[PDB]
Amino acid sequence: MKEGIHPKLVPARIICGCGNVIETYSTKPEIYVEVCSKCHPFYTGQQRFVDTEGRVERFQRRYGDSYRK
C-alpha cells in the first residue's frame, strides 16, 4: 500500500441498539449503530412487526351474519 494517502484501519467494535456487538476493523475505534443484522426484521426470522394484517380485508369484515334468514 502507498504511504501517506490512506487512513489507518484499526481494531474496532461496532455496537447496535439490540445489544449486539461486532468485532471488526475500521477507521474509527468504536461505533454505535441503530440497527444491525442480528435485530433487523427482515433478517430475524420474519419478525413481522406491527403488520400481521395481510391485509386484512375485505370479508374478514363479517360482523355479522345478522341480516336475516
Binding site: 441498539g17 454505535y32 441503530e34 412487526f49 406491527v50 403488520d51 391485509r55
Partner: peptide, 28 residues
C-alpha cells in the same frame, strides 16, 4: 441518554407502522 434513545426508539418502531411501510400501505 442513549438508554432513553433506544427505549424510545424500540417502542416507536414496534408499536406502529411508520414512514415507508405506512406510505406503502396507504398506496395499496
Amino acid at each position: 441518554t442513549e438508554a432513553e434513545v433506544v427505549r424510545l426508539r424500540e417502542y416507536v418502531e414496534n408499536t406502529w407502522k411508520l414512514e415507508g411501510e405506512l406510505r406503502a400501505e396507504v398506496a395499496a
